[PDB]
């Protein structure tokens, strides 16, 4: 209505724009606080608009408003998702699909679950219409990829996890090590979700956001 | 208000301090189906199928009352019913009111053993009138 006021939104310092838009906040009257109504809400942004490049248009980031100072909402990473339209664009007949998922533990005691798509590579000399994979190598590669993902996520924090998600650095070494077992086409991480986040530590967010 | 929603509880305390008031019959349980955002209030579903709002400080046992399914086996004979009610009350045997004399029961009397008047009595009926189906909203077989 005529009373609702705009609140600018902010992104963590790692992203180069640090600002994508403004939200709307209703009447700040009575006992209802117009600070927790703004707080604990989800903003769904696209990496393409958030980094001013068209390369990162196939995935999107969810930012949860963790805390508010003055008026600018600072938000924080809470979930990652790729666009299902790009997922189904990637999906095609003749190539077997592989899924992976696990629960990881960061040094910040952050509970993260990530799901990963995996395709197979036609290469050059196959001379066949199909690129199916015998289920034993699917077994093996799913186990090995889950193991390596857990290993890489156990000894790192959440913020550097985002630092490595941005250049899709997770989708390269897996292809590198699968080249010696079974060639895989373009793969990636589909969705990452926060299961249980520790108590909100205000001291650990200022030096990251600023 | 400490346990998550969806858990099964027994020996409910419908008001903080009654040291056990609700959900106490054998095989009965309630399910916590919601917690208020600000705490201090939760919703539970009782074995009767009704939702009740109780403060979060109320206590309860987590689990299901023992000796479950007691009503499953059929009481074979009058003897088991006699022994059952002998340690409970004087509610047995019943004796139909239509088999009594008209002095002792509004159903009684007549040459054909019939009620004669509608058996759905009002909620405002006095002590000697509240004898049939008390303030019945409907009658007959249910359809779900």
């Amino acid at each position: 209505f005529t009373k609702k006021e705009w609140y600018d939104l902010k992104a963590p310092k790692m992203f180069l724009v640090r600002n994508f838009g403004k939200t709307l906040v209703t009447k700040t009257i009575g006992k209802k606080l117009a600070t927790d109504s703004l707080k604990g809400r989800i903003y769904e942004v696209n990496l393409a608009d958030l980094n001013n490049d068209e390369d990162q248009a196939h995935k999107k980031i969810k930012l949860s408003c963790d805390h508010i100072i003055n008026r600018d909402c600072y938000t924080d990473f809470c979930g990652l998702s790729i666009t299902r339209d790009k997922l189904c664009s990637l999906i095609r007949k003749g190539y077997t699909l592989i899924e992976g998922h696990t629960d990881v533990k960061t040094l910040d005691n952050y509970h993260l679950r990530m799901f990963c798509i995996a395709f197979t590579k036609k290469r050059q000399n196959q001379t066949k219409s199909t690129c199916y994979a015998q289920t034993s190598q699917i077994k093996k590669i799913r186990k090995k990829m889950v193991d390596i993902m857990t290993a890489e996520a156990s000894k790192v924090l959440l913020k550097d996890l985002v630092k490595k998600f941005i250049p899709e650095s997770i989708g390269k070494e897996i292809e590198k090590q699968c080249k010696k077992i079974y060639p895989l086409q373009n793969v990636l991480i589909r969705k990452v979700k926060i299961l249980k986040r520790p108590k909100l530590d205000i001291s650990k967010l200022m030096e990251l956001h600023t | 208000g400490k346990m998550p929603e969806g858990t099964l509880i027994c020996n409910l305390e419908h008001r903080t301090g009654n040291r056990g008031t609700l959900v106490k019959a054998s095989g009965c349980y309630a399910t916590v189906v919601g917690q208020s955002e600000d705490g201090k209030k939760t919703k539970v579903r009782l074995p009767s199928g009704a939702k009740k709002t109780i403060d979060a400080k109320a206590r309860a046992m987590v689990g299901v009352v023992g000796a479950g399914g007691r009503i499953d086996k059929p009481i074979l004979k009058a003897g088991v019913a006699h022994h059952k009610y002998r340690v409970k009350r004087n509610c047995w045997p019943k004796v139909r009111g239509v088999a009594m004399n008209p002095v002792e029961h509004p159903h009684g009397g007549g040459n054909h053993q019939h009620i004669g008047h509608p058996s759905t009595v009002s909620r405002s009926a006095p002590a000697g009138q509240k004898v049939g189906l008390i303030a019945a909203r409907r009658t007959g077989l249910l359809r779900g």
Binding site: - | L8, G27, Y29, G66, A67, G68, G69, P74, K77
Partner: protein, 85 residues
């Protein structure tokens, strides 16, 4: 040999009561008294002790349970959900 072809334990009831009623307690007689398995000893020898009280033949330690079973399908599920947390 085999005296009762189908009636089994309900032979103590003779011809009294309904056939379907005796057969409905035939769903429960084979398990109210049956030797089920205890979880503190390991012999399939538990016996009915009361309406809710239960006991095997080794432990001499009673357990609250179902009316005529050591565990009830509701109570195993309820325990499983609690354990999962």
């Amino acid at each position: 040999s085999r005296r009762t072809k189908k009636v089994g334990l309900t032979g103590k009831y003779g011809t009294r009561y309904g056939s379907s009623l005796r057969k409905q307690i035939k769903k429960i007689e084979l398990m109210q008294h049956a030797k089920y398995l205890c979880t503190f000893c390991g012999k399939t020898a538990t016996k009915r002790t009361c309406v809710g009280i239960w006991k095997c033949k080794k432990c001499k330690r009673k357990v609250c349970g179902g009316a005529w079973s050591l565990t009830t399908p509701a109570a195993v599920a309820a325990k499983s959900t609690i354990i999962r947390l």
